Amino acid sequence: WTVPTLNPDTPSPIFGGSTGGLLRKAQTEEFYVITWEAKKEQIFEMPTGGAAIMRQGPNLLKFGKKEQCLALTTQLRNKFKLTPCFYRVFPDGKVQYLHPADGVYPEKVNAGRVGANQNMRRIGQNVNPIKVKFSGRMMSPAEI
Amino acid sequence: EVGPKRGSLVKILRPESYWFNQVGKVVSVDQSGVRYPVVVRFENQNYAGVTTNNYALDEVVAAK
Amino acid sequence: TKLFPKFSQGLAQDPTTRRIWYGLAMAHDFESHDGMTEENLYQKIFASHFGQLSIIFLWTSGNLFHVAWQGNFEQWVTDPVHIRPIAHAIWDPHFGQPAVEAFTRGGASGPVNISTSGVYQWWYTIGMRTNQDLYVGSVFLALVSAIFLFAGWLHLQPNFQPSLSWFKDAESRLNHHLSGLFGVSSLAWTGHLVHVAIPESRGQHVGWDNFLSVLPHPQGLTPFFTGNWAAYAQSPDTASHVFGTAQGSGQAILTFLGGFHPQTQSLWLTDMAHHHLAIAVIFIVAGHMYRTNFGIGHRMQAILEAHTPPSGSLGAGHKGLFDTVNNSLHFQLGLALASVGTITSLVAQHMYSLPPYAFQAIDFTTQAALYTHHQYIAGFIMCGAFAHGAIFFIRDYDPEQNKGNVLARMLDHKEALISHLSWVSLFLGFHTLGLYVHNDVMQAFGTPEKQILIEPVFAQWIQAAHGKALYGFDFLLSSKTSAAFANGQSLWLPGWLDAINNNQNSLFLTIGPGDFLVHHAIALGLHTTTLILVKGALDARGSKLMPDKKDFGYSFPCDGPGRGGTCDISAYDAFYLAVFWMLNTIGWVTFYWHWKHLTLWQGNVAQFDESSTYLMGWLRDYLWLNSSQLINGYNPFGMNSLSVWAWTFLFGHLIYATGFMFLISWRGYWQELIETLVWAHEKTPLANLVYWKDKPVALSIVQARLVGLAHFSVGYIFTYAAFLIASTSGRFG
Amino acid sequence: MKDFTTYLSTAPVIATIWFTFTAGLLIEINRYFPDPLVFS
Amino acid sequence: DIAGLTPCSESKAYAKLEKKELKTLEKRLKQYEADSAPAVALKATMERTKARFANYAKAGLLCGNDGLPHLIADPGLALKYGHAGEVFIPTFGFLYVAGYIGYVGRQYLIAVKGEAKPTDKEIIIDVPLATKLAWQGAGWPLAAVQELQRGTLLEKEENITVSPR
Amino acid sequence: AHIVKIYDTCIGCTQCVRACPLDVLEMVPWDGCKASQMASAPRTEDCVGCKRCETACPTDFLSVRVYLGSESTRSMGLSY
Amino acid sequence: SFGLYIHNDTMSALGRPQDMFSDTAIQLQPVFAQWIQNTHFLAPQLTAPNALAATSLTWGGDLVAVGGKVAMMPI
Amino acid sequence: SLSIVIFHFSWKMQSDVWGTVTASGVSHITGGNFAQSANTINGWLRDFLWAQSSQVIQSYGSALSAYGLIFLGAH
Numbered sequence A: 001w002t003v004p005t006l007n008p009d010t011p012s013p014i015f016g017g018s019t020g021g022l023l024r025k026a027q028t029e030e031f032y033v034i035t036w037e038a039k040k041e042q043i044f045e046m047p048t049g050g051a052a053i054m055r056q057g058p059n060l061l062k063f064g065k066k067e068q069c070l071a072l073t074t075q076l077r078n079k080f081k082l083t084p085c086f087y088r089v090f091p092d093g094k095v096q097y098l099h100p101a102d103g104v105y106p107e108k109v110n111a112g113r114v115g116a117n118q119n120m121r122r123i124g125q126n127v128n129p130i131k132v133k134f135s136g137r138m139m140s141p142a143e144i
Numbered sequence B: 001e002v003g004p005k006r007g008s009l010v011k012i013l014r015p016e017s018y019w020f021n022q023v024g025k026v027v028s029v030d031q032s033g034v035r036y037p038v039v040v041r042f043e044n045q046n047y048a049g050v051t052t053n054n055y056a057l058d059e060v061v062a063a064k
Numbered sequence C: 001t002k003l004f005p006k007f008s009q010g011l012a013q014d015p016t017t018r019r020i021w022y023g024l025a026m027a028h029d030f031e032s033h034d035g036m037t038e039e040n041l042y043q044k045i046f047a048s049h050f051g052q053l054s055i056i057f058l059w060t061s062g063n064l065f066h067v068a069w070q071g072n073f074e075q076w077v078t079d080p081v082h083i084r085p086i087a088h089a090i091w092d093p094h095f096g097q098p099a100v101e102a103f104t105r106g107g108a109s110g111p112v113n114i115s116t117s118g119v120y121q122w123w124y125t126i127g128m129r130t131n132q133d134l135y136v137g138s139v140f141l142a143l144v145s146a147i148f149l150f151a152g153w154l155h156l157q158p159n160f161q162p163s164l165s166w167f168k169d170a171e172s173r174l175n176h177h178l179s180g181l182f183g184v185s186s187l188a189w190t191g192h193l194v195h196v197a198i199p200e201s202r203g204q205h206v207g208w209d210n211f212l213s214v215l216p217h218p219q220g221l222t223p224f225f226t227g228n229w230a231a232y233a234q235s236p237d238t239a240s241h242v243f244g245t246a247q248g249s250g251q252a253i254l255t256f257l258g259g260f261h262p263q264t265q266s267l268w269l270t271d272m273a274h275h276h277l278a279i280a281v282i283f284i285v286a287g288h289m290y291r292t293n294f295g296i297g298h299r300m301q302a303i304l305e306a307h308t309p310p311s312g313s314l315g316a317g318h319k320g321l322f323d324t325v326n327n328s329l330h331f332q333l334g335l336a337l338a339s340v341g342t343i344t345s346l347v348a349q350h351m352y353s354l355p356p357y358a359f360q361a362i363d364f365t366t367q368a369a370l371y372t373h374h375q376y377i378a379g380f381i382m383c384g385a386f387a388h389g390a391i392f393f394i395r396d397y398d399p400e401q402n403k404g405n406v407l408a409r410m411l412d413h414k415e416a417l418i419s420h421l422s423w424v425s426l427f428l429g430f431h432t433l434g435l436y437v438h439n440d441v442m443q444a445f446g447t448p449e450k451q452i453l454i455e456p457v458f459a460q461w462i463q464a465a466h467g468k469a470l471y472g473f474d475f476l477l478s479s480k481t482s483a484a485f486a487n488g489q490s491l492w493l494p495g496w497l498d499a500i501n502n503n504q505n506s507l508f509l510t511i512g513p514g515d516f517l518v519h520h521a522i523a524l525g526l527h528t529t530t531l532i533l534v535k536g537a538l539d540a541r542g543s544k545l546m547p548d549k550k551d552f553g554y555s556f557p558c559d560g561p562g563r564g565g566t567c568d569i570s571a572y573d574a575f576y577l578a579v580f581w582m583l584n585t586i587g588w589v590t591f592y593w594h595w596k597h598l599t600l601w602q603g604n605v606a607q608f609d610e611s612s613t614y615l616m617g618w619l620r621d622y623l624w625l626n627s628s629q630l631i632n633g634y635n636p637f638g639m640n641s642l643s644v645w646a647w648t649f650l651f652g653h654l655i656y657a658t659g660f661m662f663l664i665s666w667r668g669y670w671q672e673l674i675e676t677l678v679w680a681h682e683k684t685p686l687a688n689l690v691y692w693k694d695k696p697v698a699l700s701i702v703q704a705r706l707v708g709l710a711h712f713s714v715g716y717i718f719t720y721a722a723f724l725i726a727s728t729s730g731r732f733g
Numbered sequence D: 001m002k003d004f005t006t007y008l009s010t011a012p013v014i015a016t017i018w019f020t021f022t023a024g025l026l027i028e029i030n031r032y033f034p035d036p037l038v039f040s
Numbered sequence E: 001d002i003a004g005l006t007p008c009s010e011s012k013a014y015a016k017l018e019k020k021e022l023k024t025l026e027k028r029l030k031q032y033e034a035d036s037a038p039a040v041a042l043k044a045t046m047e048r049t050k051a052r053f054a055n056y057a058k059a060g061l062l063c064g065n066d067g068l069p070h071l072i073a074d075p076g077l078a079l080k081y082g083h084a085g086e087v088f089i090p091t092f093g094f095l096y097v098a099g100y101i102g103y104v105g106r107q108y109l110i111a112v113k114g115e116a117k118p119t120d121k122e123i124i125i126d127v128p129l130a131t132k133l134a135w136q137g138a139g140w141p142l143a144a145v146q147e148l149q150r151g152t153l154l155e156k157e158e159n160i161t162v163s164p165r
Numbered sequence F: 001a002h003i004v005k006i007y008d009t010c011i012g013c014t015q016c017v018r019a020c021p022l023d024v025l026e027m028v029p030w031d032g033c034k035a036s037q038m039a040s041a042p043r044t045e046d047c048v049g050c051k052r053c054e055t056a057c058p059t060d061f062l063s064v065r066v067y068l069g070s071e072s073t074r075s076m077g078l079s080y
Numbered sequence G: 001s002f003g004l005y006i007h008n009d010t011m012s013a014l015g016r017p018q019d020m021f022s023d024t025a026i027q028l029q030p031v032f033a034q035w036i037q038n039t040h041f042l043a044p045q046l047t048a049p050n051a052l053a054a055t056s057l058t059w060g061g062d063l064v065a066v067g068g069k070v071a072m073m074p075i
Numbered sequence H: 001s002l003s004i005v006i007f008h009f010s011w012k013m014q015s016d017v018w019g020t021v022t023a024s025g026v027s028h029i030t031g032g033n034f035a036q037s038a039n040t041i042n043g044w045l046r047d048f049l050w051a052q053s054s055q056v057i058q059s060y061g062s063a064l065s066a067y068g069l070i071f072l073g074a075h
């Protein structure tokens, strides 16, 4: 498996538009693109409101925040048995592939993943806040 | 061989557990060397609605 | 990134309107600032304390200046009974001519406000007589304000920053504050009373220009150095003395008359001089207790380690508490607030019943305002004391260093403490409310003889012990054949017994079944408020619902909808809930004080005695009946000087109700709403050319609670203040 | 009939009967001993 | 008398209060005929009113200046001057019934905790079991003391869950 | 950004990962539990702090914990 | 709407009744509602020829008294 | 919203419609004070709530005393 490359030419689902879509943040900060392959034309629900028709084959939609792309991913995966992926697109044209991060969806354990933010103790074994006082900022005993 | 017998009563000693100082029934004890092999089932559910939890060998003591 | 706030880099990088709000809210939480060290924390607090001191003295300077400039103090001293003190002048271009005429009162040329703070009676009692006195005092306090402000700057400079060990010298500070700040100050105030205030009350002017050539006593210090201290108690002011003049005046400077001055109906100036002299001696001696650089005195740590009951009933006892208290600024602030908070209530309870200032008792509006003012401040201060006690347990408490001592053992039976507080509150609530409701039903059915009226015999017994002969118990000071009555019969009992058996003042007012019911309402309020504050402190570190609460800090929104839902689970939220009950409790206390004095001041105590045993009586006879003049301050036919209070009355109701919006409706609703406004602005021509720098967001969960409580509290206070002043001054103005 | 008598043993029904009985007893005592304020 | 009060039988205000209450009823009774039902109801109320004021005075209640009975709660004063029936005797009447209810409920709770499904016995009451316990609760003061003396009233601290401290 | 931590009481049931609406968590190989897998929090810059993961966790006490921290555009959930 | 009341309360409190929104001051007449009332009061003459009287006395005309009390009258 | 609707109805009917009819004319229950008072918040607090609550808070000892009790019970 290798990181896919976004194709901006991909056609988008049939949709008449709405007032729930992108704002000035997309022009200045970042936006998100989700793509998937559809087996047939089918009506699905937009996370921004309304019904859209996915074209047979490649599809492409743009969203304002990451949660919107993953919300549609959950719908497509569970209700239609599809395998979408999405990216983060910066105003200068840079594209950052996001999901699934390593080609395998996170709920399925995969080799080569390195644990992060794992504490080798129980919650009840955290130290008292007095022991981390005056550490340079506000920090919980769970941060050590 | 390790841990209490299946079906026996044990008392929970984990302070942050909902069932601390309460009595449950042993379901099974993993022999594979896991951190928390003792599985205990309780009559009263916790705030999350769960009635079973895993505990270490030294976090359970025979009831009575 | 944005500069503001400089103390929090996490906030400075926040791109929303959150940042400005939290920049303000976290400004004085020094411990949470980036890069804070313990030594720098203490130095920052020290400088802030200088800032508070200069502000207080500037505030006192302003009050002196405006009374001298715009008040009628010189006219008031000639006839305090029949002249209303003037606070300051009004200059408002929004006024109409009728308003200009209405507020022109008290002898001033233009519109003015009438003072309710009682500074006139206070300054007159201590010897101030002319506007020149007020002016000079104002200039002096402005200078003292500037010096404190400079001292705060100075001790922030490199060569004037005290070390950490200096701030932790408990023994030395206690010695100086007890003997110097308390004792010498009290001794110096005695000198002022003997040299200035007492001569002024006898018609003699003593000022800076001649105080070195005027003898406070005909025998100057000869009795003091020979031990003949009784020479200063001879020839007190007579019962016919006219305050401020030499008629009927005496020569004593230190007495124990123990009653009220017959004309001013306030405490004798010679008793207040002897009081402070004795207090000064006690505090000067008390300040030589603790060890310093001279090898004598006590070490506080030694005292605490010694007090461990041998039976082990308190475990390790007080072992380790010197470091616990000495190393925790929140433990210290909690103790300071609790002590000052209780002292503020004592000031309220004693100043109304034993008025120290001349002509204070007859100024009914001033008496009501002062009691209500200090009781509400006491209520807020008590909530803070418990708040910082809960902050201590989270941030500062160390279980290992307090192993087995009394503090750690409080956490060991917190369930017993909370559940018993719960039982007391339930019992008081069920039965106090039940008795009121029973009496309302008996009144409603026209059978007032069937209501439950329990005589307060325990309290009446205490009043009899103090000499009140109304109830016929006749023991101790009420029994003329008792040793207590006889022994004091030459010192202070004659004056005290005359004052306590006069039913026209506030010294141990007569009490009955109506007083019984309301006192149990007050106990309900105190216990319930303590329950919420104590539960908040003792569960601050954790509960069965949130075992690791201490890892989340004092204040946080919640822990989410899981585990059944965890709204308002933080110790901060317990304080937020407690403030509502503190306001309700103080509201009951002040309603009680006000109505009982309104009927006394009107010469009809029977109305209170008969209407206070059921709640329709409070609604009809206290609130509804006494609102009539207030709500007519302006109307279709005109307006009068109560229009400002009428306007403020509704102003208070409005702010109160606005607070309900933040308390009832919660964030998620508003955040969705603001998003549609964000969309609309960007799509609107000629308006999308302008744009924000902070992304608008709804207020945070915690912030809504604070702002809503603030509106609730401010409206609560303003509404009552308008009602209190307007209903009293309108009746007696 | 077993099931019906089981239904009558549910908390709301028992509470209704018990409080109806308790209220009836208190009302009837005040009917025959009106206006009781003290014990003599 | 006690705390400056006076007996209601000797109180002018108490006597005046009764006249006003009867006067109010008499005014209403004028507009009705002698045998009409409203007249019978009003006269019955008047008889109850006169009996009430007669009974309270007979019981020896103390009246304030308002003319209303005031109760005495200190046991010493109540027993010394014959006011024990106002608060003191009613106190032990309540505590007997209240403990009766509490003790019976506690017995039922303990009895059903030995069943297969304890929670089912709390929403569907075991009426035969509940009825038996209700009758036996008349001796709760004796039973409660024996448990207190036997050390079985309270549970041991080692079996009670608490949160971390 | 918020702070998300996984503790060694995890049973590797995967429910927190399935419940995360932001794809903050994932499952990695482990040997400390019977399932031989542990939850991980590699992408905490995207966590919004909803605590759906904590709601899904069966262990007692929790094995996944969210501590709300500094607020950014991502953590605040803004689409503007 | 609510701001007009706040304006009126403030002006009245400041002793400037001539600055209030009121019938004797700055006037806010519901002219549309007044016009509709007149039309309904005159309906029997022209637009409802077979109706003896208007549907309601609130439109206008003479009051009806029953037992010494007003039953309905123009509003 | 509906609280204000019914307060509007109650005050308007008492002030301008309901009343007694005699030779001298019509005397309304509140004497036509709606027009000049209902344009201020203080007018509603004083002339409507405070003034018209007199009956309910004075009903103890009468047949209407049950409304006095419920008035407090509802608060």
Ligand code: CLA
Residues within 6 Å of the ligand: C045, C046, C049, C050, C053, C166, C167, C169, C172, C173, C176, C177, C180, C181, C182, C185, C343
């Ligand atoms: C004799 C020496 C001396 C004196 C006079 C003071 C005085 C003071 N110190 Mg202290 N201090 C001393 C030695 C001394 N200190 C030493 C040796 C050390 C080092 C060991 C310190 C270390 C120290 C610190 C670290 C701090 C102080 C602070 C203070 C101030 C406390 C706030 C205040 O105004 O309280 C006023 C208190 C009183 C007037 C005493 C009476 C209080 C009662 C309860 C009030 C009621 C009385 C009466 C009824 C009121 C009548 C009111 C009227 C309207 C009728 C005060 C000015 C604090 C401060 O503000 O610093 C800027 C502070 O942070 N001191």
Ligand code: CLA
Residues within 6 Å of the ligand: C184, C187, C188, C190, C191, C192, C194, C195, C211, C212, C213, C214, C215, C216, C217, C219, C220, C221, C224, C277
């Ligand atoms: C701190 C308060 C204070 C101050 C500064 C003064 C100051 C003064 N008093 Mg007054 N006085 C005071 C309190 C005070 N008094 C009190 C409490 C009383 C009631 C007992 C009196 C009763 C009184 C009388 C009856 C007389 C004075 C007189 C005087 C004047 C001359 C004193 C003299 O010759 O001493 C000379 C004595 C000494 C040098 C020895 C003093 C020994 C003591 C133990 C010193 C203690 C110092 C103390 C611990 C520190 C306090 C703070 C400090 C800043 C002063 C002088 C202006 C006399 C006068 O002529 O007034 C016009 C006078 O006749 N005073």
Ligand code: CLA
Residues within 6 Å of the ligand: C024, C025, C026, C027, C028, C029, C030, C333, C337, C380, C381, C382, C383, C384, C385, C387, C388, C391, C554, C555, C572, C575, C706, C710, C714
């Ligand atoms: C000697 C007194 C004292 C001191 C030194 C402190 C100090 C502290 N307190 Mg404590 N506190 C006190 C008294 C004190 N407190 C009292 C009396 C109470 C009870 C009311 C509390 C309750 C309390 C709580 C609940 C908390 C603190 C906290 C704090 C810390 C941060 C304060 C901050 O940033 O505020 C910032 C202050 C503001 C942004 C302004 C708040 C304004 C309020 C809401 C009133 C607004 C009135 C309004 C403007 C009036 C308008 C009128 C209209 C007509 C115009 C700090 C260590 C906080 C903390 O984290 O501690 C560790 C915290 O959570 N305190």
Ligand code: CLA
Residues within 6 Å of the ligand: C422, C423, C425, C426, C427, C428, C429, C430, C433, C528, C531, C532, C577, C578, C580, C581
């Ligand atoms: C008037 C309003 C009101 C009332 C009556 C109460 C009452 C109570 N509060 Mg609450 N509270 C209020 C407002 C009120 N609160 C507000 C505005 C806040 C701020 C958010 C809080 C915050 C708060 C906190 C944080 C706490 C309380 C607590 C309490 C209890 C105190 C003890 C007590 O009185 O026990 C006696 C009980 C009562 C007087 C309640 C009324 C009982 C009625 C009369 C029973 C009637 C039964 C009858 C058969 C009718 C039933 C009809 C029905 C079946 C249809 C009690 C349940 C404390 C608590 O729980 O202590 C244990 C506590 O911790 N309150």
Ligand code: CLA
Residues within 6 Å of the ligand: C423, C426, C427, C428, C430, C431, E090, E091, E092, E094, E095, E098, E099, E101, E102, E103, E141, E144, E145, E148
């Ligand atoms: C019209 C009369 C009346 C009414 C309607 C009530 C109503 C009530 N009372 Mg009150 N009471 C009254 C008169 C009345 N009281 C009088 C005259 C007194 C004497 C001063 C008291 C003294 C009293 C107390 C001391 C208590 C109440 C309590 C209660 C409440 C709960 C009762 C309960 O659930 O019992 C059912 C019983 C239980 C749920 C458990 C047992 C509770 C009882 C009170 C314990 C008795 C212990 C007994 C003395 C034995 C000691 C132990 C030893 C034998 C080993 C309830 C609202 C209780 C309360 O408010 O709790 C918050 C409460 O503690 N009342």
Ligand code: CLA
Residues within 6 Å of the ligand: C457, C458, C461, E074, E075, E076, E077, E080
């Ligand atoms: C809730 C607290 C409380 C309070 C404030 C009082 C207060 C009082 N009681 Mg009461 N008493 C109470 C509870 C209380 N009692 C209880 C619970 C009981 C039952 C055990 C009694 C039993 C009782 C008796 C038997 C007598 C009093 C008496 C008195 C009065 C005078 C004696 C005295 O100094 O009492 C102050 C109270 C205390 C210090 C607490 C303990 C009081 C004990 C129990 C009684 C002491 C009696 C005393 C030695 C009698 C001296 C002779 C007398 C003629 C003055 C006084 C008004 C006396 C009285 O005047 O009777 C007419 C009396 O003879 N009480």
Ligand code: CLA
Residues within 6 Å of the ligand: C419, C420, C422, C423, C426, E101, E102, E103, E104, E105, E106, E108, E109, E125, E130, E133, E134
């Ligand atoms: C078996 C019944 C029972 C008993 C013996 C007790 C006993 C006790 N309760 Mg508890 N309680 C009960 C039921 C009971 N409770 C119920 C049903 C509730 C929910 C309303 C509560 C709510 C409650 C609170 C909130 C508090 C107590 C407290 C207390 C303690 C002091 C007494 C008190 O305040 O009573 C007050 C009693 C009540 C508030 C409710 C009484 C309701 C009825 C009268 C109880 C019996 C009903 C039951 C259905 C009967 C079954 C009969 C069976 C044959 C089928 C005491 C240990 C207090 C405490 O912790 O003190 C340390 C306290 O704060 N209880």
Ligand SMILES: CC1=C(/C=C/C(C)=C/C=C/C(C)=C/C=C/C=C(C)/C=C/C=C(C)/C=C/C2=C(C)CCCC2(C)C)C(C)(C)CCC1
Residues within 6 Å of the ligand: C330, C331, C333, C334, C335, C338, C342, C385, C386, C388, C389, C390, C392, C537
């Ligand atoms: C939580 C916490 C906290 C807090 C606390 C508080 C806030 C408290 C308060 C408290 C209080 C607020 C208390 C009070 C008390 C009081 C008392 C204890 C009193 C006493 C008195 C007396 C004893 C008197 C006597 C007498 C009389 C009565 C008469 C005659 C004279 C004489 C003097 C003999 C702290 C910080 C610690 C920390 C830890 C935790």
Ligand code: SF4
Residues within 6 Å of the ligand: F004, F019, F020, F021, F022, F023, F024, F025, F046, F047, F048, F049, F050, F051, F052, F053, F054, F066
């Ligand atoms: S708090 Fe919400 S976004 Fe963050 S890891 Fe948990 S489920 Fe995912």
Ligand code: SF4
Residues within 6 Å of the ligand: F006, F009, F010, F011, F012, F013, F014, F015, F016, F017, F038, F039, F053, F056, F057, F058, F059, F063, F064
């Ligand atoms: S839900 Fe809890 S137990 Fe399951 S994988 Fe996540 S952290 Fe581990």
